[PDB]
Scaffold this active site. Structure first.
Site, PDB file in Angstrom:
ATOM      1  N   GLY A  13       0.833  -1.188   0.000  1.00 44.23           N
ATOM      2  CA  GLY A  13       0.000   0.000   0.000  1.00 44.23           C
ATOM      3  C   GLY A  13       0.868   1.238   0.000  1.00 44.23           C
ATOM      4  CB  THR A  14       0.799   4.326  -1.602  1.00 43.64           C
ATOM      5  OG1 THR A  14       0.965   3.324  -2.613  1.00 43.64           O
ATOM      6  CG2 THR A  14       1.915   5.349  -1.788  1.00 43.64           C
ATOM      7  N   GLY A  15       0.524   5.826   0.880  1.00 40.59           N
ATOM      8  CA  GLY A  15      -0.001   6.701   1.906  1.00 40.59           C
ATOM      9  C   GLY A  15       1.008   6.999   3.002  1.00 40.59           C
ATOM     10  CE1 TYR A  17       7.442   9.890   8.165  1.00 37.49           C
ATOM     11  CE2 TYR A  17       6.543   7.911   9.165  1.00 37.49           C
ATOM     12  CZ  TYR A  17       7.132   9.151   9.288  1.00 37.49           C
ATOM     13  OH  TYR A  17       7.411   9.647  10.540  1.00 37.49           O
ATOM     14  N   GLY A  18       5.469   7.033   2.580  1.00 35.08           N
ATOM     15  CA  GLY A  18       5.827   6.717   1.212  1.00 35.08           C
ATOM     16  C   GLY A  18       5.141   5.470   0.699  1.00 35.08           C
ATOM     17  N   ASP A 132       0.129   8.414  16.999  1.00 30.75           N
ATOM     18  CA  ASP A 132      -0.727   7.936  15.923  1.00 30.75           C
ATOM     19  C   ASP A 132      -1.232   6.537  16.245  1.00 30.75           C
TER      20      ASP A 132
END
Ligand SMILES: CCc1nc(Nc2ccc(S(N)(=O)=O)cc2)nc2nc[nH]c12
Ligand SMILES: [Cl-]
Ligand SMILES: [Cl-]
Ligand SMILES: [Cl-]
Length: 252
Positions: A13-15, A17-18, A132
């Site tokens: 997956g993305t989102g 940080y990177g 978080d």
């Protein structure tokens, strides 16, 4: 130590940080992931900051914390790869999604496992001293072990302390909201506005978790959600609760 030492299996997956990719180490075939970040547009001071960050992260070895393994630099693609343990069970936000869609509440034993092992992870992090802590950053391995992972959205888990004017009991409040969402398949405080959410959070009122869950579990989660931080249980007082047993802990 080099990118050629691994083979990318696929993008997980993305989102944030990177880009997060599932990879295999060529020497032994071990399954890992790496987060690829782009440092090229960060200052020298920013890269220094993050270097000390990931050094401290490399100084963390705990069965209930996502294990760091290696760091790789690629000046050709200005990419920094951070190699970490792969958790094949996925994240907790996906489990909550699955339960909501299938109208299936999660077992109390699973909630106790998450509570126990996340409390131990938080204990470790408090020993090595705004977070978080949320379902999307909590992962499961293949043997029911829970591992702690490393703006438009509403801050559903933000304590009243971090909303008026942060400490370990704020971590306890966030854990309480996470466990509440595990039991009820929804956060303890819902709102369309951030102002309405702040009001609801300050009043400190919420529904009981579904009645299929013990009065003891509701009691401890409610204690974690106390408006006053000094009334919330410490890590030690959480672990002393008679609900928490050996089988709720990690197992290799
Ligand atoms: C994306 C961040 C991340 N993910 C995983 N594993 C994993 C995730 C989702 C699924 S899913 N939604 O397909 O079921 C399955 C496995 N491990 C990790 N270790 C460190 N960061 C990790
Ligand atoms: Cl899965
Ligand atoms: Cl339901
Ligand atoms: Cl209810």
């Amino acid at each position: 130590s080099r990118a050629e030492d691994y083979e990318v299996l696929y993008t997980i997956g993305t989102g944030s940080y990177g880009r997060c990719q599932k990879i295999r180490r060529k020497s032994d075939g071990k399954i890992l992931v790496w987060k690829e970040l782009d440092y090229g547009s960060m200052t020298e001071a920013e890269k220094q900051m993050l270097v000390s960050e990931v050094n401290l992260l490399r100084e963390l070895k705990h069965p209930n914390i996502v294990r760091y393994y290696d760091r790789i630099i690629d000046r050709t693609n200005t990419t920094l790869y951070i190699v970490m343990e792969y958790c094949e069970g996925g994240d907790l936000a996906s489990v909550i999604t699955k339960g909501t869609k299938e109208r299936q509440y999660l077992d109390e034993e699973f909630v106790l496992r998450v509570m126990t092992q996340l409390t131990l992870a938080l204990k470790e992090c408090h020993r090595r001293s705004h977070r978080d802590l949320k379902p999307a950053n909590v992962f499961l391995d293949g043997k029911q072990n829970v591992k702690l992972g490393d703006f438009v959205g509403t801050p559903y888990y933000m304590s009243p302390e971090q909303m008026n004017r942060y400490n370990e009991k704020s971590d306890i409040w966030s854990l309480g909201c996470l466990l509440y969402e595990l039991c009820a398949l929804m956060p303890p405080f819902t709102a369309f506005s951030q102002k309405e959410l702040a009001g609801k959070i300050r009043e400190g009122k919420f529904r009981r978790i579904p009645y299929r869950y013990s009065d003891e579990l509701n009691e401890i989660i409610t204690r974690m959600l106390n408006l006053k931080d000094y009334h919330r249980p410490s890590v030690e007082e959480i672990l002393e609760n008679p609900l928490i047993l050996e089988h709720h802990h990690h197992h290799h």
